[PDB]
Design a protein around this ligand. Structure first.
Ligand SMILES: O=C(O)C1(c2ccc(-c3ccc(Cl)c(Cl)c3)c(F)c2)CC1
Ligand SMILES: O=C(O)C1(c2ccc(-c3ccc(Cl)c(Cl)c3)c(F)c2)CC1
Lengths: 115, 116, 116, 115
């Protein structure tokens, strides 16, 4: 599993459950091409987005649908979504985790790149 | 000044100086139109992006050019940039500050919104 | 002003106002001695904690009273407080800003250090 | 496992490995009483600190030895350590994860409290 996403909620102190996540890859013409998608689990995690075969080097965008998340909780949020854009490079380690911590007016994100 | 950006550097314990910032506004046709740009000062602050008159209601994208910042420091970072996308001024004019904290493999951003 | 604190609120998208801050200094006997205290203003900023003369070399603890802040807003938070502990002025006088971002179950803090 | 700690490194984009962590419980006289300790694993995680039996309600402090961590990497850090102080309450969910993201002049921490 080369690409995982984990999302936490800083207001409730819990995983962010049932958040839609869409991943895109940058195409040669500079447009965003759909690549993978899913909803986070009870543990705030999304696995099995892709295989090693399909996950080639390039620029990827992970879009997290935070607006729908907050509204479903009755909270008015600031952002239209949260977007994480990065380069996958074969020289570095091969397993990528994109982790995000959400609040209504703020978010933080880090990368954990292993083995 | 209705739209400001302030950026700090978590590795140096200092303001993030000379960070390029580009702002876009979603157009009636649904693509990103260039709206304003600038770079942070020695205090890590960017003022004078726009005016009250020109900063009308819309969906704005503030793109903080984190990769160019780290690369100019000779460091290889993870992200291409940090984007903050939000609806602005839909309840009348407000003043917005986007505050950010940068590390090579992480960033945090928050918004400070003032005014009736 | 050689020691300042600035605090933002991630839930309201605003400065964190009326946050109590207590600073302690480790004493020759190795316990925490009270050093200074204050509360943040409407801009989320706390100035005037100490003076250049009194802010000598040592190990300082800046305790940001996050629980009292959230409880005064009628919210039940997780942490008792946020502590930032650091050696100061060991290479001569510097100016320090401790910047923090608060949510009910999370906080972030960073330091900005200026001067030769 | 009622109490877990997970530590990440924002400079390298990796787990924070082999970081000493000491947990204390507040005693009736307001002093900090040693409770549990360990070093984070290859995945930045520390498990098996305590049992449900010993983990009673009260105030706890999780001290992370970040200074030693950064110095072992050749980096001069700002903090003497990172401390996370919180109340364990039986009314809320029963599994606590304390997560921390480290940089030399900064750290962030959140709580993930589940089932
Ligand atoms: O398996 C992981 O990576 C976990 C994790 C631990 C810490 C965080 C976290 C902690 C702090 C910040 Cl600022 C950010 Cl962006 C992320 C996170 F999002 C996830 C423990 C769940
Ligand atoms: O002018 C402000 O608002 C200041 C400020 C204070 C705190 C931060 C800060 C502190 C922590 C985080 Cl996680 C974030 Cl995203 C921002 C910040 F970026 C800037 C004091 C400089």
């Amino acid at each position: 599993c080369p690409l995982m996403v984990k999302v936490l909620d800083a207001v409730r102190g819990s995983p962010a459950i049932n958040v839609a996540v869409h991943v895109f890859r940058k195409a040669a013409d500079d447009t965003w091409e759909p690549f993978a998608s899913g909803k986070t689990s009870e543990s705030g995690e999304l696995h099995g987005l892709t295989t090693e075969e399909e996950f080639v080097e390039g620029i990827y965008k992970v879009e997290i649908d935070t607006k729908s998340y907050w509204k479903a909780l009755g909270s008015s949020p600031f952002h239209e979504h949260a977007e994480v854009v990065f380069t996958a490079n074969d020289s570095g380690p091969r397993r990528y985790t994109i982790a995000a911590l959400l609040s209504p007016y703020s978010y933080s994100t880090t990368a954990v790149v292993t083995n």
